[PDB]
């Protein structure tokens, strides 16, 4: 308690000191000193990151190339130390981006490795994924390399929502149309199916799978291979349903598969599965009723299309 009273007065005094120096136009290393003592514990104090940038911008004008490189290397170390303490601060990640974007010869390979390290610690850190995308763009890293990165992350352990998300963005880049190709789609279906049969509680694979089911070319355009793959998925989900009777993701996916295969032919079973799913996932009853209503309306329209 008294230590907090100590820290508070130390931050307070350092803060006043920085503001005081700022009005005076004293853009020097003493400010870097003061802010380092505040930003470590309080990285969300954005005005202090602004002060550091004003100081660094000022100092580069009135110092040698070698002196400015030294200041930049000291900044990279300070930033890394801040990130280790709080890897989820917008201000710290932005300052690192601001810094790297103005360097003459930035080492992007080192930055990609920084990202790999932080993603080992927290594979869901969206600040780090965002930074990695920034570095990948700057360094002109190809989508295929990043696709390789995501697979290792997905297979080596769980916590995969962020990795699947990244794939959803990378795949369309490997096949850019101004809606994935079927060969690509079939491979992704295989990969994601492994995922949710490895961990059927992992919601992330199920969310990505629902996307892949929509990313096709249509039910009356079903190829023999895709038709067979989806029917196989359907049977494999029924298998899982036996092993995990409380698993709602597999029940929803069964409904979605029957939709993808033949809405009218599977109408009976679709309605049966809605009843089971609502029993198993009652908090979603309202959602499921609206989905069922939408499906029954689609079916009425399909039936009226009859010649």
């Amino acid at each position: 308690r008294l230590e907090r009273e100590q820290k508070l007065k130390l931050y307070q005094s350092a803060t006043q000191a920085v503001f005081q120096k700022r009005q005076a136009g004293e853009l020097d290393e003493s400010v870097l000193e003061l802010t380092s003592q505040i930003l470590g514990a309080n990285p969300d104090f954005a005005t202090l990151w602004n002060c550091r940038r004003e100081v660094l911008q000022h100092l580069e004008t009135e110092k040698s190339p070698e002196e400015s490189a030294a200041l930049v290397k000291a900044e990279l170390g300070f930033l890394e130390s801040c990130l280790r303490v709080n890897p989820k601060s917008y201000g710290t990640w932005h300052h690192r981006c601001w810094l790297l974007s103005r360097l003459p010869e930035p080492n992007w390979a080192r930055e990609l490795e920084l990202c790999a390290r932080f993603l080992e610690a927290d594979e869901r850190n969206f600040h780090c994924w965002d930074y990695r995308r920034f570095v990948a763009a700057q360094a002109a890293v190809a989508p295929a390399e990043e696709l390789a990165f995501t697979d290792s992350l997905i297979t080596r352990n769980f916590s995969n929502y962020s990795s699947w998300h990244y794939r959803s963005c990378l795949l369309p880049q490997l096949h850019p149309q101004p809606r994935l190709p079927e060969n690509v789609l079939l491979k992704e279906l295989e990969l994601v199916q492994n995922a949710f049969f490895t961990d059927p509680n992992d919601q992330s694979a199920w969310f990505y799978h629902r996307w892949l089911l929509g990313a096709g070319s249509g039910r009356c355009e079903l190829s023999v291979e895709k038709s067979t793959v989806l029917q196989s998925e359907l049977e494999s989900c029924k298998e899982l349903q036996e092993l995990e009777p409380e698993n709602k993701w597999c029940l929803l996916t069964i409904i979605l598969l029957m939709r993808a295969l033949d809405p009218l032919l599977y109408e009976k079973e679709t309605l049966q599965y809605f009843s089971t799913l609502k029993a198993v996932d009652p908090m979603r009853a309202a959602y499921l009723d609206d989905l069922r209503s939408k499906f029954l309306l689609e079916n009425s329209v399909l039936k009226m299309e009859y010649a």
């Binding site: 969206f126 992330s204 908090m283 959602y287």
Partner: protein, 323 residues
């Protein structure tokens, strides 16, 4: 899987009088450490007091002077005196002045010029002169301008194009193009799309599903898959659902019980989760959540602006929602 377990002696009734008392006395260690967001802190306190019918217990004249002293020569508003201007605190300031019907306390023309100056060629907005790009700031920009009646000052079509480029495979939105979906970002982007009349471009059934899957067995909502529930993500999720006409897709009673369990019966205020330390941020979002769920003791709240609807009716800024 990851969830909280609510205990059977958790509060189960709304303690409004205690909440007004808590906010009325707030700011008489963490207070001084959060001075970098003071303007937003003031907004949270005033808005929740107004939702509870208690705004008069706050100090209007003192806040109006503080706001004027936080507007910089460039037109932007800072979080506190001597701090730097930012879109976040510019919005907060304008929300406060709207609550108080005192917009001409600051220089509106310069606010408009500041917001206008932060738009980039791709339609995005930086938060300030240092260039951080985030859909949060697209929302701050249009919400600020909407409240001032000056939405026409920015490039709206390019702003729309940028926000839509942030829409993801799952129907949600992230910070920037390619960023992962997050409830906070979804709230900002659906708010943005409500203000700019573009809700028809949202896949409401897909996003609605992603949002209702945020509800955990405890009744609380998380902000993305595999995270613990929190009384504030609970708010971003519900406001987004209301904007897209899918509020009924969550279990209202279970969520209401979770929110009420986050109250501190002794001190007043809400915490992020039951038993934790309260703060004005979670007090606002807990009370705002309860209002959206139809709590009679609380004023109707705008899901777009998180201000009382009666205030928005007054300035005639009421975005049409999906339903």
């Amino acid at each position: 899987q990851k969830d909280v377990t609510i205990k059977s002696d958790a509060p189960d009734t709304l303690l409004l009088e205690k909440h007004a008392d808590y906010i009325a006395s707030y700011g008489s260690y963490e207070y001084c450490m959060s001075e970098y967001l003071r303007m937003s802190g003031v907004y949270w306190g005033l808005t929740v007091m107004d939702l509870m019918g208690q705004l008069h217990r706050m100090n209007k004249e003192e806040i109006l002077v503080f706001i004027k002293s936080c507007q910089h020569e460039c037109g932007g508003v800072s979080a506190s005196i001597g701090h730097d201007p930012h879109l976040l605190y510019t919005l907060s300031a304008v929300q406060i002045l709207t609550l108080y019907d005192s917009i001409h306390v600051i220089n509106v023309d310069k606010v408009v010029a500041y917001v206008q100056s932060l738009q980039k060629e791709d339609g995005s907005f930086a938060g300030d002169i240092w260039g951080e790009i985030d859909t949060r700031f697209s929302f701050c920009a249009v919400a600020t301008l909407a409240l001032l009646g000056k939405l026409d000052a920015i490039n709206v079509e390019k702003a729309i194009e940028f926000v839509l480029s942030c829409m993801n495979f799952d129907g949600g939105f992230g910070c920037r193009p390619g960023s992962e979906s997050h409830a906070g970002q979804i709230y900002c982007c659906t708010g943005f799309l409500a203000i700019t009349s573009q809700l028809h471009q949202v896949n409401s059934d897909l996003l609605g599903w992603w949002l209702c899957e945020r509800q955990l067995p405890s009744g609380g909502l998380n902000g993305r898959p595999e995270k613990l529930p929190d009384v504030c993500y609970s708010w971003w999720v519900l406001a987004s659902l209301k904007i897209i006409g899918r509020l009924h897709w969550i279990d209202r009673e279970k969520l209401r019980s979770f929110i009420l369990a986050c109250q501190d019966e002794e001190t007043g205020g809400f915490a992020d989760r039951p038993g934790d330390m309260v703060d004005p941020f979670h007090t606002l979002f807990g009370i705002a959540g309860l209002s959206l769920l139809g709590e009679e003791q609380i004023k109707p709240v705008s899901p777009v602006f998180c201000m009382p609807e009666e205030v928005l009716q007054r300035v005639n800024v009421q975005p049409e929602l999906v339903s």
